[PDB]
Amino acid sequence: GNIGDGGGAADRVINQILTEMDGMSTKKNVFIIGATNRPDIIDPAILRPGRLDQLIYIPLPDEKSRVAILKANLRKSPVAKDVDLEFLAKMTNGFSGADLTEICQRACKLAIRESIESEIVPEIRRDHFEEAMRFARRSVSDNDIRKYEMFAQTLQQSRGF
Amino acid sequence: GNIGDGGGAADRVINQILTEMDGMSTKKNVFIIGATNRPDIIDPAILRPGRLDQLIYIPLPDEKSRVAILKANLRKSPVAKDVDLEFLAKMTNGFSGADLTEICQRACKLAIRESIESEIVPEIRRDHFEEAMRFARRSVSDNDIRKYEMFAQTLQQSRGF
Amino acid sequence: GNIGDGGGAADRVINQILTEMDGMSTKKNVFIIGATNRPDIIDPAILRPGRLDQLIYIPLPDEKSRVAILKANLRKSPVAKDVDLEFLAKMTNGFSGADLTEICQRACKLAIRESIESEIVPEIRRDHFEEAMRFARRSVSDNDIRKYEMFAQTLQQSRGF
Numbered sequence: 001g002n003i004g005d006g007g008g009a010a011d012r013v014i015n016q017i018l019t020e021m022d023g024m025s026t027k028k029n030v031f032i033i034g035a036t037n038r039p040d041i042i043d044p045a046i047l048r049p050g051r052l053d054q055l056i057y058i059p060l061p062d063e064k065s066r067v068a069i070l071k072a073n074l075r076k077s078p079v080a081k082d083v084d085l086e087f088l089a090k091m092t093n094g095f096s097g098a099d100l101t102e103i104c105q106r107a108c109k110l111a112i113r114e115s116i117e118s119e120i121v122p123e124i125r126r127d128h129f130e131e132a133m134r135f136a137r138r139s140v141s142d143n144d145i146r147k148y149e150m151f152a153q154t155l156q157q158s159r160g161f
Numbered sequence: 162g163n164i165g166d167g168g169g170a171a172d173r174v175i176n177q178i179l180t181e182m183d184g185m186s187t188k189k190n191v192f193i194i195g196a197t198n199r200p201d202i203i204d205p206a207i208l209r210p211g212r213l214d215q216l217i218y219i220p221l222p223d224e225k226s227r228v229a230i231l232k233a234n235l236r237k238s239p240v241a242k243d244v245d246l247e248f249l250a251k252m253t254n255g256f257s258g259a260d261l262t263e264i265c266q267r268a269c270k271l272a273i274r275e276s277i278e279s280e281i282v283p284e285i286r287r288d289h290f291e292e293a294m295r296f297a298r299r300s301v302s303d304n305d306i307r308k309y310e311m312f313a314q315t316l317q318q319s320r321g322f
Numbered sequence: 323g324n325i326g327d328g329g330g331a332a333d334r335v336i337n338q339i340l341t342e343m344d345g346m347s348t349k350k351n352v353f354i355i356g357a358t359n360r361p362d363i364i365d366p367a368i369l370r371p372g373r374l375d376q377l378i379y380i381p382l383p384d385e386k387s388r389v390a391i392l393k394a395n396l397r398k399s400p401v402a403k404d405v406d407l408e409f410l411a412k413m414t415n416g417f418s419g420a421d422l423t424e425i426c427q428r429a430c431k432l433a434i435r436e437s438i439e440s441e442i443v444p445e446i447r448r449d450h451f452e453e454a455m456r457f458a459r460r461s462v463s464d465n466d467i468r469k470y471e472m473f474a475q476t477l478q479q480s481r482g483f
């Protein structure tokens with residue numbers, strides 16, 4: 001990793017699976033899907049035209065997905081109607097799914113503390129999301145982004161070399 | 162690979178096969194054929210004069226082969242006569258067999274989608290190949306080419322050293 | 323160049339011109355245009371927002387320009403009508419202006435020799451371009467191309483750093 005060895009990053013566990021996936025007939029309905037995060041160090045051996053032909057890029061979530069993740073990760077919480085779901089996605093532009101989830105995690109974590117502290121009503125208010133807004137961080141940097149969408153348009157050139 | 166180790170790229174699986182292929186008599190009709198893509202890192206031990214004597218170079222496909230690959234990879238498809246087989250090879254000059262195949266793959270893939278979409282006639286038209294023409298890429302670069310045909314004329318010098 | 327020095331590639335002839343071009347008022351009609359071929363080693367000092375704001379990329383010539391260059395570089399030659407201007411641009415896809423010009427230069431050079439040799443009629447025939455077709459070379463490689471169109475979409479990131 002990172003620097004790497006003197007040769008290719010091949011393995012006796014990679015060759016045996018890439019050979020196994022070639023014995024199957026084309027008419028079987030089995031579908032294998034691979035996932036990675038650093039597509040520059042994987043061997044082109046599995047990227048050969050006939051094992052991994054189609055390459056699909058997953059970009060950053062857009063507005064329609066950002067609003068959906070928030071309506072999904074709190075489906076079992078009594079969130080009040082005072083908050084606005086689209087508004088959060090309106091500020092959130094350069095955040096990934098981990099950031100969008102951890103914002104809601106922080107908001108729920110602070111709300112659940114004041115809920116118990118008031119015992120010495122149990123609903124999430126707008127300020128609860130507001131505190132989580134300011135403590136937001138960026139899971140990914142900027143330089144790696146353009147690295148990712150420079151492999152998207154020019155990727156067939158890496159096959160074979 | 163790539164950089165390589167401190168010594169030669171020899172192996173106990175290479176020496177045992179190069180020794181095995183020397184025990185056979187010359188009058189047997191068994192013929193062994195090797196194939197590689199980076200003929201600068203293989204040991205000259207198997208390239209000795211008496212195991213791998215003749216060296217044969219495979220250049221890029223020419224016009225006559227480019228037209229043939231297209232007439233071969235779609236032999237089981239109802240392609241209409243509106244398209245021209247020679248015309249595609251006329252534009253395609255600096256593409257390899259993988260590119261020539263993936264062009265037809267893309268054209269068939271887009272045609273098969275509109276065929277189903279029209280259900281809400283099943284033949285490949287000229288525009289179907291036209292879209293695949295623009296999304297063409299180059300499997301190989303340019304610098305590696307002259308690398309390949311500089312080993313073709315001067316190769317006996319690498320034997321023994 | 324190439325490797326470069328330990329610091330920036332600044333000069334007392336670059337600073338004095340970039341300072342001089344800032345003294346002029348915006349209402350003057352003087353327009354300065356710069357041209358380069360390796361836009362990764364020039365200082366961002368002249369690329370500051372207010373001296374060189376707009377960045378314009380010159381891609382490879384397309385079909386409409388390839389046919390035009392041929393109709394332009396032989397405007398003073400008695401070329402016969404047997405040849406086809408669009409046909410040459412139909413084969414020529416991955417060639418730059420220097421290659422397109424040198425093809426015509428070679429064709430004219432071989433025609434002018436047989437014109438004198440026949441003295442022991444003076445028009446360019448199809449075979450004259452045909453010989454020049456086979457001796458064609460590529461002025462630019464492939465790896466530098468994707469290098470050029472990877473700076474085109476992501477260029478504002480290089481400003482300031």
Ligand SMILES: Cc1cc2c(C(N)=O)cccc2n1-c1nc2c(c(NCc3ccccc3)n1)COCC2
Pocket residue numbers: 061065068069072073097098099101
């Ligand atoms: C708990 C949860 C965590 C999480 C994370 C994460 N970094 O933890 C990343 C992506 C989705 C995630 N989800 C998630 N989980 C689900 C859904 C959903 N929304 C749609 C979606 C998913 C991925 C992409 C776009 C949009 N998101 C949809 O309902 C079922 C489960």
Ligand SMILES: Cc1cc2c(C(N)=O)cccc2n1-c1nc2c(c(NCc3ccccc3)n1)COCC2
Pocket residue numbers: 049222226229230233234257258259260262
């Ligand atoms: C599906 C197919 C894929 C493919 C590929 C590839 N990169 O996937 C490369 C070369 C030939 C290929 N073929 C192919 N397959 C066949 C033929 C044929 N044409 C003649 C030829 C072959 C190699 C060379 C020149 C010309 N081409 C001939 O009929 C039988 C099978």
Ligand SMILES: Cc1cc2c(C(N)=O)cccc2n1-c1nc2c(c(NCc3ccccc3)n1)COCC2
Pocket residue numbers: 383387390391394395419420421423
């Ligand atoms: C002799 C000549 C050489 C040359 C070269 C070269 N590497 O020597 C490169 C580009 C244009 C060139 N020309 C050239 N010269 C001219 C024209 C023209 N065609 C239009 C054009 C120009 C640049 C770009 C696209 C298309 N091309 C147009 O008429 C006047 C002079």
